[PDB]
mmCIF file of all heavy atoms in Angstrom:
data_model
loop_
_atom_site.group_PDB
_atom_site.id
_atom_site.type_symbol
_atom_site.label_atom_id
_atom_site.label_comp_id
_atom_site.label_asym_id
_atom_site.label_seq_id
_atom_site.Cartn_x
_atom_site.Cartn_y
_atom_site.Cartn_z
ATOM 1 N N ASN B 520 -34.684 39.556 53.494
ATOM 2 C CA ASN B 520 -35.934 39.959 54.142
ATOM 3 C C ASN B 520 -36.147 39.248 55.445
ATOM 4 O O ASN B 520 -36.873 38.285 55.551
ATOM 5 C CB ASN B 520 -37.175 39.939 53.240
ATOM 6 C CG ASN B 520 -37.061 38.957 52.116
ATOM 7 O OD1 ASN B 520 -36.696 39.319 51.001
ATOM 8 N ND2 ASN B 520 -37.367 37.708 52.398
ATOM 9 N N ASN B 521 -35.496 39.788 56.453
ATOM 10 C CA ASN B 521 -35.393 39.178 57.749
ATOM 11 C C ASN B 521 -35.394 40.299 58.745
ATOM 12 O O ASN B 521 -35.172 40.077 59.942
ATOM 13 C CB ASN B 521 -34.032 38.524 57.849
ATOM 14 C CG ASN B 521 -34.107 37.061 57.819
ATOM 15 O OD1 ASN B 521 -33.541 36.402 58.686
ATOM 16 N ND2 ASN B 521 -34.819 36.519 56.836
ATOM 17 N N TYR B 522 -35.568 41.519 58.254
ATOM 18 C CA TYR B 522 -35.153 42.642 59.080
ATOM 19 C C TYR B 522 -36.197 43.700 59.225
ATOM 20 O O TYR B 522 -36.873 44.097 58.259
ATOM 21 C CB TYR B 522 -33.810 43.265 58.586
ATOM 22 C CG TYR B 522 -32.599 42.402 58.881
ATOM 23 C CD1 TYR B 522 -32.094 41.534 57.916
ATOM 24 C CD2 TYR B 522 -31.979 42.433 60.148
ATOM 25 C CE1 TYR B 522 -31.003 40.720 58.186
ATOM 26 C CE2 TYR B 522 -30.892 41.625 60.432
ATOM 27 C CZ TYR B 522 -30.415 40.759 59.440
ATOM 28 O OH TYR B 522 -29.347 39.932 59.719
ATOM 29 N N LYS B 523 -36.304 44.176 60.454
ATOM 30 C CA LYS B 523 -37.034 45.397 60.731
ATOM 31 C C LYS B 523 -36.084 46.543 61.136
ATOM 32 O O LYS B 523 -34.968 46.301 61.617
ATOM 33 C CB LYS B 523 -38.126 45.128 61.767
ATOM 34 C CG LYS B 523 -39.480 44.831 61.122
ATOM 35 C CD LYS B 523 -40.488 44.253 62.111
ATOM 36 C CE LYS B 523 -41.892 44.178 61.505
ATOM 37 N NZ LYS B 523 -42.569 42.872 61.800
ATOM 38 N N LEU B 524 -36.545 47.770 60.893
ATOM 39 C CA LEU B 524 -35.823 48.990 61.181
ATOM 40 C C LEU B 524 -36.686 49.944 62.025
ATOM 41 O O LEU B 524 -37.763 50.325 61.610
ATOM 42 C CB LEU B 524 -35.454 49.680 59.867
ATOM 43 C CG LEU B 524 -34.448 50.813 60.009
ATOM 44 C CD1 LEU B 524 -33.127 50.213 60.433
ATOM 45 C CD2 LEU B 524 -34.280 51.610 58.744
ATOM 46 N N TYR B 525 -36.188 50.348 63.187
ATOM 47 C CA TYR B 525 -36.882 51.302 64.046
ATOM 48 C C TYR B 525 -36.142 52.639 64.169
ATOM 49 O O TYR B 525 -34.920 52.655 64.338
ATOM 50 C CB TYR B 525 -37.024 50.701 65.428
ATOM 51 C CG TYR B 525 -37.654 49.355 65.421
ATOM 52 C CD1 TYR B 525 -36.882 48.199 65.224
ATOM 53 C CD2 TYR B 525 -39.034 49.213 65.597
ATOM 54 C CE1 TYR B 525 -37.470 46.933 65.208
ATOM 55 C CE2 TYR B 525 -39.640 47.953 65.584
ATOM 56 C CZ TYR B 525 -38.864 46.815 65.384
ATOM 57 O OH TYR B 525 -39.467 45.571 65.368
ATOM 58 N N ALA B 526 -36.864 53.755 64.117
ATOM 59 C CA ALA B 526 -36.319 55.040 64.598
ATOM 60 C C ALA B 526 -36.336 55.068 66.126
ATOM 61 O O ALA B 526 -37.386 54.991 66.726
ATOM 62 C CB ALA B 526 -37.092 56.228 64.030
ATOM 63 N N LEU B 527 -35.172 55.146 66.760
ATOM 64 C CA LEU B 527 -35.081 55.258 68.245
ATOM 65 C C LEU B 527 -35.622 56.603 68.744
ATOM 66 O O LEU B 527 -35.577 57.585 67.999
ATOM 67 C CB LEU B 527 -33.632 54.999 68.740
ATOM 68 C CG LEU B 527 -33.131 53.613 68.261
ATOM 69 C CD1 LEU B 527 -31.671 53.365 68.576
ATOM 70 C CD2 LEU B 527 -34.015 52.455 68.772
ATOM 71 N N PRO B 528 -36.135 56.651 69.982
ATOM 72 C CA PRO B 528 -36.565 57.982 70.469
ATOM 73 C C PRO B 528 -35.450 59.035 70.257
ATOM 74 O O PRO B 528 -34.306 58.736 70.492
ATOM 75 C CB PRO B 528 -36.856 57.762 71.980
ATOM 76 C CG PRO B 528 -36.820 56.283 72.214
ATOM 77 C CD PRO B 528 -36.233 55.584 71.004
ATOM 78 N N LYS B 529 -35.773 60.226 69.783
ATOM 79 C CA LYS B 529 -34.750 61.238 69.556
ATOM 80 C C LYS B 529 -34.316 61.965 70.882
ATOM 81 O O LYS B 529 -35.115 62.669 71.556
ATOM 82 C CB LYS B 529 -35.229 62.237 68.490
ATOM 83 C CG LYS B 529 -34.431 63.544 68.390
ATOM 84 C CD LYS B 529 -33.659 63.684 67.072
ATOM 85 C CE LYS B 529 -34.315 64.683 66.123
ATOM 86 N NZ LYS B 529 -33.873 66.076 66.395
ATOM 87 N N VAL B 530 -33.055 61.771 71.247
ATOM 88 C CA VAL B 530 -32.497 62.445 72.406
ATOM 89 C C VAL B 530 -31.561 63.540 71.917
ATOM 90 O O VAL B 530 -31.939 64.712 71.934
ATOM 91 C CB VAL B 530 -31.774 61.500 73.371
ATOM 92 C CG1 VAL B 530 -31.411 62.272 74.642
ATOM 93 C CG2 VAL B 530 -32.645 60.272 73.677
ATOM 94 N N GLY B 531 -30.368 63.186 71.449
ATOM 95 C CA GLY B 531 -29.486 64.209 70.864
ATOM 96 C C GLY B 531 -30.140 65.100 69.791
ATOM 97 O O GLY B 531 -31.355 65.058 69.574
ATOM 98 N N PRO B 532 -29.337 65.914 69.091
ATOM 99 C CA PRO B 532 -29.877 66.441 67.834
ATOM 100 C C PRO B 532 -29.636 65.458 66.670
ATOM 101 O O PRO B 532 -29.891 65.844 65.525
ATOM 102 C CB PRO B 532 -29.038 67.686 67.590
ATOM 103 C CG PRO B 532 -27.712 67.348 68.229
ATOM 104 C CD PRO B 532 -27.921 66.284 69.284
ATOM 105 N N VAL B 533 -29.123 64.244 66.960
ATOM 106 C CA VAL B 533 -28.995 63.169 65.951
ATOM 107 C C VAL B 533 -30.050 62.066 66.122
ATOM 108 O O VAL B 533 -30.191 61.493 67.197
ATOM 109 C CB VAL B 533 -27.592 62.526 65.891
ATOM 110 C CG1 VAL B 533 -27.481 61.624 64.658
ATOM 111 C CG2 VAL B 533 -26.533 63.601 65.786
ATOM 112 N N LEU B 534 -30.804 61.802 65.052
ATOM 113 C CA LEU B 534 -31.790 60.741 65.093
ATOM 114 C C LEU B 534 -31.081 59.501 64.707
ATOM 115 O O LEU B 534 -30.336 59.541 63.743
ATOM 116 C CB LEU B 534 -32.863 60.999 64.058
ATOM 117 C CG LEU B 534 -34.171 60.183 64.099
ATOM 118 C CD1 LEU B 534 -34.768 60.008 65.490
ATOM 119 C CD2 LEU B 534 -35.143 60.928 63.192
ATOM 120 N N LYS B 535 -31.323 58.396 65.414
ATOM 121 C CA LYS B 535 -30.652 57.145 65.087
ATOM 122 C C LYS B 535 -31.606 55.952 64.955
ATOM 123 O O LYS B 535 -32.496 55.796 65.795
ATOM 124 C CB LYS B 535 -29.596 56.812 66.143
ATOM 125 C CG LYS B 535 -28.441 57.795 66.316
ATOM 126 C CD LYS B 535 -27.557 57.322 67.463
ATOM 127 C CE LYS B 535 -26.316 58.184 67.646
ATOM 128 N NZ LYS B 535 -25.109 57.402 68.115
ATOM 129 N N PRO B 536 -31.398 55.083 63.923
ATOM 130 C CA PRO B 536 -32.163 53.863 63.734
ATOM 131 C C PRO B 536 -31.618 52.656 64.439
ATOM 132 O O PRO B 536 -30.434 52.620 64.776
ATOM 133 C CB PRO B 536 -32.032 53.622 62.242
ATOM 134 C CG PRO B 536 -30.691 54.152 61.924
ATOM 135 C CD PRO B 536 -30.664 55.430 62.691
ATOM 136 N N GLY B 537 -32.478 51.648 64.615
ATOM 137 C CA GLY B 537 -32.056 50.333 65.114
ATOM 138 C C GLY B 537 -32.552 49.196 64.231
ATOM 139 O O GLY B 537 -33.748 49.120 63.903
ATOM 140 N N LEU B 538 -31.622 48.324 63.829
ATOM 141 C CA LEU B 538 -31.933 47.137 63.037
ATOM 142 C C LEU B 538 -32.342 45.997 63.919
ATOM 143 O O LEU B 538 -31.736 45.787 64.978
ATOM 144 C CB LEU B 538 -30.716 46.672 62.239
ATOM 145 C CG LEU B 538 -30.555 46.844 60.723
ATOM 146 C CD1 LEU B 538 -29.459 45.878 60.306
ATOM 147 C CD2 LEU B 538 -31.820 46.605 59.901
ATOM 148 N N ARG B 539 -33.338 45.237 63.455
ATOM 149 C CA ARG B 539 -33.792 44.024 64.127
ATOM 150 C C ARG B 539 -34.017 42.877 63.129
ATOM 151 O O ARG B 539 -34.746 43.019 62.130
ATOM 152 C CB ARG B 539 -35.074 44.287 64.917
ATOM 153 C CG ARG B 539 -35.234 43.363 66.101
ATOM 154 C CD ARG B 539 -36.442 42.444 66.026
ATOM 155 N NE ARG B 539 -37.633 43.062 66.624
ATOM 156 C CZ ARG B 539 -38.567 42.418 67.328
ATOM 157 N NH1 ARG B 539 -38.481 41.111 67.573
ATOM 158 N NH2 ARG B 539 -39.591 43.101 67.810
ATOM 159 N N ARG B 540 -33.369 41.748 63.409
ATOM 160 C CA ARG B 540 -33.612 40.507 62.692
ATOM 161 C C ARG B 540 -34.829 39.797 63.249
ATOM 162 O O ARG B 540 -35.043 39.772 64.459
ATOM 163 C CB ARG B 540 -32.417 39.568 62.818
ATOM 164 C CG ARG B 540 -32.225 38.782 61.549
ATOM 165 C CD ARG B 540 -31.583 37.434 61.746
ATOM 166 N NE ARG B 540 -30.537 37.409 62.757
ATOM 167 C CZ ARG B 540 -29.751 36.358 62.972
ATOM 168 N NH1 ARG B 540 -29.894 35.254 62.247
ATOM 169 N NH2 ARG B 540 -28.831 36.403 63.921
ATOM 170 N N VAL B 541 -35.606 39.178 62.378
ATOM 171 C CA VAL B 541 -36.703 38.346 62.869
ATOM 172 C C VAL B 541 -36.596 36.864 62.468
ATOM 173 O O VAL B 541 -36.011 36.526 61.423
ATOM 174 C CB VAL B 541 -38.100 38.914 62.507
ATOM 175 C CG1 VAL B 541 -39.006 38.903 63.739
ATOM 176 C CG2 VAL B 541 -37.995 40.325 61.948
ATOM 177 N N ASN B 542 -37.129 35.994 63.341
ATOM 178 C CA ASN B 542 -37.476 34.596 63.015
ATOM 179 C C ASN B 542 -38.826 34.598 62.288
ATOM 180 O O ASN B 542 -39.728 33.814 62.584
ATOM 181 C CB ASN B 542 -37.522 33.725 64.276
ATOM 182 C CG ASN B 542 -38.375 34.340 65.373
ATOM 183 O OD1 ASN B 542 -39.520 34.716 65.133
ATOM 184 N ND2 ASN B 542 -37.815 34.463 66.574
ATOM 185 N N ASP B 543 -38.933 35.546 61.359
ATOM 186 C CA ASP B 543 -39.992 35.645 60.357
ATOM 187 C C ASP B 543 -41.458 35.628 60.841
ATOM 188 O O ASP B 543 -41.731 35.632 62.047
ATOM 189 C CB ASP B 543 -39.720 34.660 59.192
ATOM 190 C CG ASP B 543 -38.964 35.321 58.013
ATOM 191 O OD1 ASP B 543 -38.622 36.533 58.097
ATOM 192 O OD2 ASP B 543 -38.731 34.627 56.995
ATOM 193 N N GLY B 544 -42.387 35.693 59.884
ATOM 194 C CA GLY B 544 -42.053 35.841 58.443
ATOM 195 C C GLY B 544 -41.919 37.289 57.990
ATOM 196 O O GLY B 544 -41.684 37.585 56.805
ATOM 197 N N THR B 545 -42.012 38.171 58.980
ATOM 198 C CA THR B 545 -42.446 39.553 58.809
ATOM 199 C C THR B 545 -41.334 40.456 58.263
ATOM 200 O O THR B 545 -41.589 41.552 57.744
ATOM 201 C CB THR B 545 -42.973 40.105 60.165
ATOM 202 O OG1 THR B 545 -42.894 39.080 61.183
ATOM 203 C CG2 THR B 545 -44.436 40.668 60.041
ATOM 204 N N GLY B 546 -40.101 39.976 58.362
ATOM 205 C CA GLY B 546 -38.940 40.790 58.039
ATOM 206 C C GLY B 546 -38.938 41.272 56.613
ATOM 207 O O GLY B 546 -39.401 40.581 55.724
ATOM 208 N N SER B 547 -38.386 42.459 56.402
ATOM 209 C CA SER B 547 -38.271 43.064 55.079
ATOM 210 C C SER B 547 -36.781 43.393 54.742
ATOM 211 O O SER B 547 -35.887 43.082 55.565
ATOM 212 C CB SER B 547 -39.194 44.273 55.022
ATOM 213 O OG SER B 547 -39.104 44.880 53.786
ATOM 214 N N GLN B 548 -36.511 43.960 53.550
ATOM 215 C CA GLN B 548 -35.134 44.255 53.131
ATOM 216 C C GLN B 548 -34.730 45.701 53.401
ATOM 217 O O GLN B 548 -35.341 46.634 52.863
ATOM 218 C CB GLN B 548 -34.943 43.993 51.642
ATOM 219 C CG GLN B 548 -35.269 42.586 51.184
ATOM 220 C CD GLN B 548 -34.735 42.276 49.783
ATOM 221 O OE1 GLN B 548 -35.092 42.928 48.800
ATOM 222 N NE2 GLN B 548 -33.876 41.267 49.689
#
Side-chain angles (χ1 to χ4, degrees):
Chain B
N520 27 263
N521 251 231
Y522 287 96
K523 265 167 171 136
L524 192 67
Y525 307 86
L527 304 173
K529 165 113 105 86
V530 188
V533 191
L534 193 44
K535 298 177 176 214
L538 254 198
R539 207 243 270 217
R540 215 208 322 188
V541 227
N542 50 51
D543 266 1
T545 359
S547 180
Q548 303 195 300

